[PDB]
Amino acid sequence: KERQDRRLGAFLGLAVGDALGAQVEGLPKGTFPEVREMKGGGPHRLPPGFWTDDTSQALCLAESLLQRGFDPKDQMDRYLRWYREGYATRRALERYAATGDPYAGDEAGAGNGPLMRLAPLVLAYENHPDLLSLARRAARTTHGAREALEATEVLAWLLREALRGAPKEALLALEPFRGADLHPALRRVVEGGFWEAPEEGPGYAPGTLAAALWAFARGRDFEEGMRLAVNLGGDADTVGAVYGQLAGAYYGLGAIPGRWLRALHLREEMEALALALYRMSMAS
Numbered sequence: 001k002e003r004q005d006r007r008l009g010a011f012l013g014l015a016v017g018d019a020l021g022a023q024v025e026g027l028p029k030g031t032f033p034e035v036r037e038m039k040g041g042g043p044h045r046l047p048p049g050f051w052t053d054d055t056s057q058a059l060c061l062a063e064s065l066l067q068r069g070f071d072p073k074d075q076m077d078r079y080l081r082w083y084r085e086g087y088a089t090r091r092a093l094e095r096y097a098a099t100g101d102p103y104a105g106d107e108a109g110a111g112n113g114p115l116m117r118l119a120p121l122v123l124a125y126e127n128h129p130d131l132l133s134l135a136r137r138a139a140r141t142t143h144g145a146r147e148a149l150e151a152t153e154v155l156a157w158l159l160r161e162a163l164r165g166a167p168k169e170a171l172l173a174l175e176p177f178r179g180a181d182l183h184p185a186l187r188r189v190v191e192g193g194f195w196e197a198p199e200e201g202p203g204y205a206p207g208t209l210a211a212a213l214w215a216f217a218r219g220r221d222f223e224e225g226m227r228l229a230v231n232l233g234g235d236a237d238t239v240g241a242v243y244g245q246l247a248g249a250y251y252g253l254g255a256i257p258g259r260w261l262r263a264l265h266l267r268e269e270m271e272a273l274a275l276a277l278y279r280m281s282m283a284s
Contacts, residue, residue, distance in 0.1 A: 004278060005252040006163050010119045011274035012267065013222070013248020014058055014241045016260050018051040018116070020230050021201070021240030027233040029200045035230050038263040042237075049263035052237050054116040056082060059266075061138070062120040062273045066280060070125070070134055072102035072141050079141075089113055092142040103137070105144035112208035112238045114139035114152045119245045122159040123277035132156050143205075147183035151205040154190070155242065162249035171250070172217055189213070201234030208235065212242035222251040 022042045024035055040048035060078040068074050076096045083093050088109050095104040121138055125131050135156035136149050143149070158171055177190045185206040194213035202208050211232055219225020229243040230236045248256065261267055 002252075004275060005254055006165075006249050007123050007278040008253040008271055008274045009248035009251060009256060010159060010163065010245050011062075011123060011248070011277070012253060012261060012264065012270055013244035013246075013256060014116070014119050015051050015055045015244070015264060015266075015270060016248075016256060017226060017229065017240030017242070017244025018055045018237050019046070019049055019240075019264065020226060020260070021236030021238065022046055022050075022052050024230060024233050024236045027236075029231070029233040032233065034227065036227055038260055047265075049260075050265045053082075053086070054113070054238065054241065058117040058120055059270070059273070061117045062277060065120055065124045066273070066276050070137075072137055075138070076102045076104065076141055089142045096141075103140040103144075105140050105142045105148075107144050107146075109143035110145035110148045110205055111143060111203055112148070112151075112205045112235065112242070114143050114148055115155055115205060115208055115242045116238055118152065118155045118159055118242075119248075120273075120277060122156055122163065123274060124280045126160055126163055126281045131160060145205070147186050148205040150182050150186050151209045154186070155209060155245070158246055159249050162246055168216070168250065171246075172213065198232055201229075201232040201236045201239040203235040203238070208239055208242055211239045212246060215239070215243045216246055216250070219247070222247050222255045223257050 024032060025042050038048045040046045057079060060082055061075055064075045064078055080093050080097055088111055092104040121135060125134055132153045135152050139149050139152040154177060161171055174190045189206050189210040194210040198211045201211055215225045215229035219228055225243060225247050230240045
């Protein structure tokens with residue numbers, strides 16, 4: 001159960017962070033009382049425990065992986081179907097709808113969207129030799145900027161190592177990326193830019209990753225780090241979700257506040273998905 005706990009933690013942690021962060025999405029840091037509980041709210045009056053369309057994407061990706069392995073075309077079919085059933089990423093979806101090209105992300109897409117759906121992929125392809133390559137392809141479906149693709153690869157590595165029990169010190173050391181040829185902004189993050197508290201929750205991929213790493217570094221447990229992450233305001237839903245995936249894999253499901261999990265929308269459905277993805281990683 002110890003091992004399963006890490007996979008469930010990474011998956012549910014993503015949703016928990018998305019739900020909590022959504023409560024203060026768009027608010028400047030230090031202009032609102034400390035967020036500590038699942039109260040819902042935010043610009044979209046979300047009910048307590050409800051998450052954003054981004055977690056919806058992670059769920060679609062999870063289902064795609066379980067049904068037909070790594071299939072970017074199917075991933076986009078699902079995102080598009082979900083997109084139209086509702087009322088940079090939409091541009092990617094419309095590009096795919098018109099051209100059939102699954103890797104519809106453009107060079108202008110340096111946003112943090114791809115970081116929102118890492119967990120599902122790593123849970124299922126943890127042991128695949130081309131994991132980082134798969135992560136890059138999954139990011140390319142909606143975002144094409146160098147730094148967004150590389151940030152996704154770094155998070156993929158972080159999650160794989162965390163799931164394998166790597167210590168916090170090793171995760172933050174980011175050894176394989178030190179001296180690597182990365183976009184300048186991401187290089188600054190890997191070299192220690194995350195040790196300093198950010199002035200807000202960034203929407204830019206490298207900045208979002210740095211904010212999550214900062215919260216992970218300073219937090220002593222899942223709850224403390226999560227609160228640090230979401231209280232940065234800004235794109236708190238995504239920063240919270242990125243922190244949630246990493247901290248969830250590191251601390252485990254059992255370490256996530258029970259009241260947050262009990263309030264979480266589709267908790268049971270996600271637990272089932274997480275376990276199924278983990279099972280898939282241990283099979284053929």
